[PDB]
Amino acid sequence: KNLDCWVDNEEDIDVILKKSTILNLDINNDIISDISGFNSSVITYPDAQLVPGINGKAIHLVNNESSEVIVHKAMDIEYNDMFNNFTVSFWLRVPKVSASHLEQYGTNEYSIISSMKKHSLSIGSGWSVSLKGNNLIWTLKDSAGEVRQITFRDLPDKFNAYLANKWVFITITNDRLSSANLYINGVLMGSAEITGLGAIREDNNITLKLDRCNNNNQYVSIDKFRIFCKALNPKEIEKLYTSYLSITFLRDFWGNPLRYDTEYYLIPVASSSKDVQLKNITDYMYLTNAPSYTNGKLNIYYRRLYNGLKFIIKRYTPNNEIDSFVKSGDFIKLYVSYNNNEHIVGYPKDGNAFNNLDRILRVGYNAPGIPLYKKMEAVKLRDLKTYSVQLKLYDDKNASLGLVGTHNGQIGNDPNRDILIASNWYFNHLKDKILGCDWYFVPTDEGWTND
Ligand SMILES: CC(=O)N[C@H]1[C@H](O[C@@H]2[C@H](O[C@@]3(C(=O)O)C[C@H](O)[C@@H](NC(C)=O)[C@H]([C@H](O)[C@@H](CO)O[C@]4(C(=O)O)C[C@H](O)[C@@H](NC(C)=O)[C@H]([C@H](O)[C@H](O)CO)O4)O3)[C@@H](O)[C@H](O[C@H]3[C@H](O)[C@@H](O)[C@H](OCC[Si](C)(C)C)O[C@@H]3CO)O[C@@H]2CO)O[C@H](CO)[C@H](O)[C@@H]1O[C@@H]1O[C@H](CO)[C@H](O)[C@H](O[C@]2(C(=O)O)C[C@H](O)[C@@H](NC(C)=O)[C@H]([C@H](O)[C@H](O)CO)O2)[C@H]1O
């Protein structure tokens, strides 16, 4: 803590994050402003775009020189990082680079955030955040012209990868008396020795914009951009990361808010390589293997997306109000979209159920006279870091029919399958690290396109 900023009380992480923050980009009524107490100024150019963020709206940048945000560092923070420790933390969302783009822009490195005066592949001093292929780069440069750099390679499985259009949380801490550490989602991804460079003298503006990017199509989103005047520690990091994740909103596979009337494919967290298939209208659902995509020469692979059943969420009692956002604790009707029709998902009174308890879900059941329970509550009962949802079924008396999940079993002469069910069993295993009632809601997205 020798080169850290504040000098008061080294115990309360919550209070430490606040007191040590020196720049803080928040967005309110469509304006980006600094919300640390320093009131640095931010100038939002004309083509800076706002999109859903992990908690309110975020900044979306596209590839024209008029899509940018500038921060004019205030008087009393202007120089902080010339010698002291600083930490930069932000949420990022980069689209899965298409294999074509990996071929033709894979050696093109460009910035998205930078404190460092630029000129025709010649650089000032300061730092930048840059992308080159599927690499995320941190980069410190000092008055003498000396550089320190971290290069984090994204894993080759894009379903899991940090640079494949999911929101991820970046934090970079630089302790001038030791290292620069690169974290993603609270984990240490990369690091380098920064002992030895002196005097980081940079631009008086922090700049948000794509810089020297060859692909006319790139975009990226940045939220909650923040500068602390210290190398935060991982226990500080963990707390900073989870603080952004308030349960009150459910999220889609990408980290964006869960909405009604929109098509999502279901993929189970515990079985991420499966899609949902349906036996027949009126019948059960089961897990089947999704088709996968590999490419050797590019070192990349993913299970493909956009097949299996699409579902749609609707409010139980719906009509007049304005929130298209599914709140955890909301009661919904779940439907399957198959040829323009909406077939509600439910469990009919007395439908088979393994063992009398794991109730086999049914798509489109219509047996006259037979009650069909379809009131669901979508909830976030665990695993906050994972953008996943749980779904609870009720019968028509407000008794619980269980969380939605699967159960291996056999039905008639179809083969062994993992059939979708509703069961109260899950409710005793809620601390498990992996659970079978955990769902990803996946909407089509510009950022992910199967090649
Ligand atoms: C199906 C099941 O195992 N559990 C369902 C549960 O059923 C019970 C019952 O057994 C009980 C029990 O759990 O309730 C009670 C029983 O007294 C004890 N045994 C003793 C004396 O302790 C067993 C025991 O604890 C079981 C665990 O359940 O463990 C052993 C075992 O001793 O038998 C442990 C052993 O190491 C295992 N061996 C091996 C090599 O793995 C075995 C073995 O796996 C099992 O024997 C078979 O899998 O388990 O627990 C049932 O035994 C009972 O069965 C009925 C039977 O179904 C029925 O046919 C029979 O009727 C018949 C006679 Si006749 C056909 C000749 C006419 O009647 C008997 C008795 O009634 O049913 C009980 C009903 O209550 O019931 C609940 C309902 O709420 C659930 O169905 C349980 O299943 C879970 O369902 C979830 C979704 O609904 C998931 O699918 C779970 O699956 C995952 C998961 O966690 O989601 C799926 C994962 O892929 C899987 N991964 C891995 C790595 O395994 C996991 C994993 O299996 C477990 O999480 C633990 O690792 O499950 C379902 O598990």
UniProtKB/Swiss-Prot annotation:
Coiled coil (UniProt feature): none
Cysteines joined through disulfide linkages: 213-229
What is the protein name stated in its UniProt record? Tetanus toxin heavy chain
Which species is listed as the source? Clostridium tetani (strain Massachusetts / E88)
